[PDB]
Scaffold this active site. Structure first.
Site, PDB file in Angstrom:
ATOM      1  CG  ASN A   1      -0.378  13.961  -0.793  1.00 31.72           C
ATOM      2  OD1 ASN A   1      -1.441  14.263  -1.353  1.00 31.72           O
ATOM      3  ND2 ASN A   1       0.537  14.868  -0.471  1.00 31.72           N
TER       4      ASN A   1
ATOM      5  CB  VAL B   1      -0.452   6.576   2.656  1.00 31.46           C
ATOM      6  CG1 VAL B   1      -1.492   7.565   2.193  1.00 31.46           C
ATOM      7  CG2 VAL B   1      -0.469   5.326   1.779  1.00 31.46           C
ATOM      8  CB  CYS B   2       1.964  11.882   3.507  1.00 34.17           C
ATOM      9  SG  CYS B   2       2.096  13.285   4.657  1.00 34.17           S
ATOM     10  CG  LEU B   3      -4.886  10.428   5.315  1.00 35.93           C
ATOM     11  CD1 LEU B   3      -5.429  11.365   4.229  1.00 35.93           C
ATOM     12  CD2 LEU B   3      -5.593   9.082   5.296  1.00 35.93           C
TER      13      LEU B   3
ATOM     14  CG  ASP C   1       1.369  16.826   3.704  1.00 37.78           C
ATOM     15  OD1 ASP C   1       1.796  16.629   4.861  1.00 37.78           O
ATOM     16  OD2 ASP C   1       0.484  17.667   3.427  1.00 37.78           O
TER      17      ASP C   1
END
Length: 190
Positions: free
Chosen positions: A109, A116-118, A149
């Protein structure tokens, strides 16, 4: 625009200058809200936080900035230290801070640029969420990595390829090793 809006903006700037010259300037709505989030934090021992630039400044041009250091004590990344910078604009909490990961790490992620994929940082962001939520979310990325993701396709693939495999790839990369031809940072000290 309109001549009226123009005039209104210019009066507002004047007021802003006046305020910055007072002893004890009024803080913007965004900075007051960030102070409240900081004052309300309840961090686990696996997370430490450094205020780099404080919301306490009246300097509009100096965006508040925090460093968040995640050191999980369980899971794939156990005992590695991953630090993030969180940069707030004057539009918090309508917008969340920009989050940048400051280490090259092997994680599905997070990309090699520090992106950052959050979910809570974009599609699931609400102004009723807070710094505690963001921080808990960054922690949870390391406790429950998700291959769905995939900013880092190599990590996403390995996580699917099983747990012993991903576990050893993470251990290598956290010690500064390379996977494929990309070198990751040594984050295991102490």
């Amino acid at each position: 625009g309109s001549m009226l809006k123009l005039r209104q903006l210019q009066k507002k700037k004047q007021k802003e200058n006046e305020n910055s010259s007072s002893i004890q300037p009024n803080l913007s709505a965004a900075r007051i809200r960030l102070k409240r989030d900081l004052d309300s934090l309840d961090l686990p021992p696996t997370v430490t936080l450094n205020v780099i630039t404080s919301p306490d400044s009246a300097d509009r041009s100096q965006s508040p900035k925090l460093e968040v250091i995640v050191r999980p004590d369980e899971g794939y990344y156990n005992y590695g230290s991953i630090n993030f910078n969180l940069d707030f604009n004057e539009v918090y909490p309508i917008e969340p801070p920009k989050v940048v990961c400051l280490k090259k790490i092997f994680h599905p992620n997070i990309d090699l640029k520090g992106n950052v994929c959050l979910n809570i940082l974009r599609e699931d962001w609400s102004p009723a969420l807070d710094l505690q939520s963001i921080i808990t979310g960054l922690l949870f990325l390391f406790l429950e990595p998700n291959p769905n993701d995939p900013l880092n396709k190599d990590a996403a693939k390995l996580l699917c390829e099983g747990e012993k495999e991903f576990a050893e790839a993470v251990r290598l990369t956290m010690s500064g090793g390379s996977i494929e031809h990309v070198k990751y940072d040594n984050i295991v000290s102490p």
